[PDB]
Design a protein around this ligand. Structure first.
Ligand SMILES: NC(=O)c1ccc[n+]([C@@H]2O[C@H](COP(=O)([O-])OP(=O)(O)OC[C@H]3O[C@@H](n4cnc5c(N)ncnc54)[C@H](OP(=O)(O)O)[C@@H]3O)[C@@H](O)[C@H]2O)c1
Ligand SMILES: Nc1nc(=O)c2nc(CNc3ccc(C(=O)N[C@@H](CCC(=O)O)C(=O)O)cc3)cnc2[nH]1
Ligand SMILES: [Mn+2]
Ligand SMILES: [Mn+2]
Ligand SMILES: [Mn+2]
Length: 159
């Protein structure tokens, strides 16, 4: 099973200048809980944005060019990325925009954080078709001293 996990600001913005400008510790904790002990697939730009391997996960990087770091696994196509995960119950696709576009048609589950924040961005999560997806979990949180915007954790499953 393939799942996508992402955090979306207003208008589906996910990034600006190869960064995420907000800081929501509760959302990063959600990301870690839902990805730990699973393979994670990311594109090369997202690898550069994170800047280091994510511990406790098999890190798989898509790039058309040879890898430059043997602490992670480098692959050259979507099918190779999936194969490199092996026989696991759930593969997590962690972006960025181009990678999400390619994996969305193959995904059964979306883990989405909706952040109440207006962000100038240059990268968006794909337009997906709402009729294709059932919301099976949602949890709203107001802003607090650690998290400066309100946010909604949602899990959707392909109908
Ligand atoms: N808010 C969130 O949830 C979230 C999550 C992830 C990322 N982000 C943000 O998203 C932005 C990065 O997204 P992006 O769309 O620019 O880039 P990306 O999807 O992370 O990376 C694209 C790169 O991946 C490689 N690639 C993708 N598909 C491939 C394929 N089928 N075969 C081979 N290589 C492939 C290519 O690398 P080569 O050029 O080396 O061939 C391509 O240039 C950043 O702003 C980051 O902060 C946000
Ligand atoms: N829900 C969600 N939120 C995000 O912010 C997010 N970001 C990315 C891409 N960017 C990043 C940037 C940093 C870390 C990261 O350092 N995660 C640590 C959390 C511990 C910490 O630094 O606070 C991790 O171990 O997972 C992960 C993804 C991909 N999917 C996401 N999914
Ligand atoms: Mn092929
Ligand atoms: Mn197999
Ligand atoms: Mn806000």
């Amino acid at each position: 099973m393939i799942s996508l996990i992402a955090a979306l600001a207003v208008d589906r913005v996910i990034g600006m200048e190869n960064a995420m400008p907000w800081n929501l510790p509760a959302d990063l904790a959600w990301f870690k809980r839902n990805t730990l002990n699973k393979p994670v697939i990311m594109g090369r730009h997202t690898w550069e944005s994170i800047g280091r391997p994510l511990p406790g996960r098999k890190n798989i990087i898509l790039s058309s060019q040879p890898g430059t770091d043997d602490r992670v696994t480098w692959v050259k196509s979507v099918d190779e990325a999936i194969a490199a995960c092996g026989d696991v119950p759930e593969i997590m696709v962690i972006g960025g925009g181009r990678v999400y576009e390619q994996f969305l048609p193959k995904a059964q589950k979306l883990y989405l954080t909706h952040i109440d924040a207006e962000v100038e961005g240059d990268t968006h999560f794909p337009d997906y078709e709402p009729d294709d997806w059932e919301s099976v979990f949602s949890e709203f949180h107001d802003a607090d001293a650690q998290n400066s915007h309100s946010y909604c954790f949602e899990i959707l499953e392909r109908r």
